[PDB]
Symmetry: D2
């Protein structure tokens, strides 16, 4: 029988996840949304594209959670944006409620799924989502690092004029100010960035500007598109996480995972390097940070706790 992949949210990222899941033959897809028609339409559109490329996959649009029954992977993009100066508490209120509905859906119909959360704000929403759903935490993760890592790698490849395949980056934490990059564990062909700077490939000021561009990467795309946000690279990033699970690949990926002691964090979701295989998060890799790195990490973890506490405020259920 084929793997089944449910996508909870059929907006621009949802649709892109479906298309990539077909192209890559990851299994049958269910596109779920509250909007009537959108998931049916995209699903059929993608299904109609399939003979051109030759992949055999079912695409079902649904407005009911029962459609996701037995899904091997669920990818959650359902939620609302920060439109445009609405409150920070307003946002959390709407998306926490969505995390509660989705969490009930998955618990009922797809309890054994590997769940990948994309909904913002990520570190909090994925934390709310595993509490609300009750799934084992090693089976519920947030996508954030792979995306930041993709942007950073892309910018470095431009800066150095080498393949994106030969750039490696190491990032912890979440997006924006919460990102904690390690330049010293980032490389071209294994040559660490500091050594590349020593050799003149680029300057420290330029590397810093590239790191900042990475922090602001989501907002840059918003600024160019105006009416929506990034969907191609976010979709690609989550599909890479799903693929590592489906194929038991044991990729080492930066993902929002539940820490239970590591880096001195407990009962919370933080962007860390994880090995993702057929049993979800199989190992969380604990590096030995230096004093500056530790400071920035502890600052990032504290900022995420603050958000989680705001969520407990609005939804004390948690």
């Amino acid at each position: 029988a084929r793997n089944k992949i449910a996508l909870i949210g059929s907006g621009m990222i949802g649709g892109t996840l479906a298309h990539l899941a077909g192209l890559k033959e990851l299994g049958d897809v269910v596109l779920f949304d509250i909007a009537e028609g959108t998931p049916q339409g995209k699903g059929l559109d993608i299904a109609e594209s399939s003979p051109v490329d030759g992949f055999d996959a079912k695409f079902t649009g649904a407005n009911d959670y029962a459609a996701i029954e037995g899904a091997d992977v669920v990818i959650v993009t359902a939620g609302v944006p920060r439109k445009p100066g609405m409150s920070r508490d307003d946002l959390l209120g709407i998306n926490l409620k969505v995390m509660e509905q989705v969490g009930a859906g998955i618990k009922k119909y797809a309890p054994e799924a590997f769940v990948i959360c994309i909904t913002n704000p990520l570190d909090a929403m994925v934390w709310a989502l595993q509490k609300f759903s009750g799934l084992p935490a090693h089976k519920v993760v947030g996508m954030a690092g792979v995306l930041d890592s993709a942007r950073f790698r892309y910018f470095l490849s431009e800066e150095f004029n080498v393949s994106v395949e030969d750039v490696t980056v190491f990032v912890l934490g979440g997006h924006g100010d919460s990102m904690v990059p390690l330049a010293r564990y980032s490389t071209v062909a294994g040559i660490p960035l500091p050594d590349l700077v020593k050799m003149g490939w680029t300057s420290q000021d330029k590397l810093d500007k590239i790191i900042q561009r990475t922090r602001d990467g989501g907002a840059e795309i918003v600024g160019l598109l105006k009416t929506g946000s990034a969907f191609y690279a976010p979709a690609a990033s989550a599909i890479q996480m799903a693929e590592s699970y489906l194929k038991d690949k044991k990729r080492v990926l930066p993902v929002a995972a539940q820490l239970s002691g590591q880096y001195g964090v407990k009962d919370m979701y933080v962007g860390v390097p994880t090995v993702i295989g057929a049993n979800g998060v199989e190992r969380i890799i604990e590096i030995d940070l230096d004093k500056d790195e530790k400071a920035q990490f502890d600052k990032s973890v504290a900022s995420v706790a603050g958000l989680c506490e705001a969520c407990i405020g609005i939804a004390p259920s948690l």
Copy 2:
């Protein structure tokens, strides 16, 4: 020198074309549009996604036609969605696009998607002045894709083992040939005799193909199909770039085949490094010929109208 692909139009189809061209490593990509920001944002988003799968391609977003200079392939989705109003709006778009290509990409293989397809690609090759064998319209591959998918469902077999044969345009102007459509080489009428489905059901599947575009519009509400149309045009671009010589149903200029001259019609073509290298002229029976003729006459009308807006044609 990488191949260069220019996408004129950075809407939903344009973006999907760019993503596929990236994923399939077809070359560097330029997203053109009149709307500032959109091409640039989609291009950067796709570029940023590239480390994930590891394709190396440049994605440039542009608002100036000069950006398409030297493009090996150009895919045109520009246009807007009164019959003589939409024609006049879209003809003017073909006019600009034609001028752009003439100036900056004269050696390109050009694939037109803008509706109404047969009239638009016909106008576009006149406006651009490019050799007709290098200017084609995508329509058949999309209709053929929908029809195969529906048959795949009905018969519960792989999409890869269904072949269908279509002439003409979309909707009422489509001319399918059941007898030249098959599963593993067994023609549809033989499949019906074997009990794989009924004629009534086959007829409904043909009708569903006719209405296929309107079906997706009714489900999406705010816009139209873009995955299957994007995939269909990429297939045509890929056959050119790789000199594959696939036999694809495409809007091409006929010059005597099927008794048609100086007109674009959906016909079976072999597409290779030289563009349209061959047009296949099949022997239509009486009823097929009548359907094909009605279809060509209807394309003739749209063209006559276009002449009566832009006498330049």
Copy 3:
């Protein structure tokens, strides 16, 4: 957990099978053989190739059947290349492989490539006791692959657009159906009428497909074909593993279809997660029916020769 694919025999075909399974990411691979060193060697070599393209798959070489335990797919190329000496040697190999499969991989989909194919797959399902819908032989896809390749060269079109239809086995036992072979849905006889080729040329192509294996042996001198056969089996494996429901010519057990019972014969099948899910039974004309029966009678003879050797059957 990943799919597991067990390859019984690690010669040139087995190694190619392993490499293709790797590149296509069909799952973990077990190479099995008697020759010491060989399977462990090719497995390691392929494994060490894996970081280049980035596929993650285990390659285990083994000289003992226990390594194949729980295989989702087993592909058997084991055997040796007088007629009653060939049947005797390979019958004994089919017996050893069958008990191996019975003991360790009873739920596997099994694909037999050992010659003479139609008799050995029939022997293999009897010895193994596996359900028949789960034991098939590879022959039709290989013949069909060659035939399509020759036609693509003749017509100068993509291999993707040529479909051929073949029943029976290799050589003189092949029964091709020109009327169910096409280019983009146009049957070969109709392509002859358009002047794309002649009937003489088609006949030579058909004879070339009958002799296609001997041709490669005649070029190589010291061995036989392995790339096309390997690719052919992998397509079969893949349709099973991905539940594609491709319609493929395969040696399958008939039980009434075409008038044949308790015998394996090359027929069109639908291959999906349950193995052979349907045997397609087309309406043969009088001459096809006669050619089919002659081919079936010939296979009946080989099987009778086997029962005389191994009354177990």
Copy 4:
């Protein structure tokens, strides 16, 4: 047109190159060899496989160098498995191969695989007289692949998340840099501290990488590795053909970098549409410098023996 890839040598490596080149749609392929039938047979066998997977590529087996005319990439495996006797035999081959490339493919990117590699590639570019930035030796990619595979097993992670950095050639001439080899950006020496492994186990993996080729020869008994060597050369070719600018360890001509002039050594290179577009010059510590200089000295030694046997150089 399509890219053209000429394979000089149609043994096990050459056939695998041709298979990979077809599968990955890198272009048309010419298999060359002095042996009659072999290249024709492998070419035909692979071509006959093409309809299964659907790649469109021509395969030509030839026994005359004129067949390679116009080749964009040439991959040389020609050769033979007394040290001065081996150098004498294989230098003869590089002279003949050099003469054919010079006459028929003077604009090719040439990838040399024939042993002993750093001497033979050096010799090949002198005999052929092609620009040095267009003639390279494949060695480092293969060592890097084995090394990354062994580490991937060691730590139970994807092969895609291991990076290794290697200078020099094979065996004792290899100069790995543990500090520039990683999992997910974490260097080998730090992994030891974090207790993921021990220094003693790293050392064994390094030694295993040095003996990797001999390890495969021991398992196969009667030949040497061909899957990983073929994958490695294809990666290099592909970086040229698709202008990827991959950072690959390759035998390249140094002209000052690392203190070496007019000699081929394994170094980090950026390979793009112009061949070796950059040679990366890292900052070696004193022990790495001594290791590297010892390795370079042993390559200079071989080149001198070569001049002994062929003063021409």
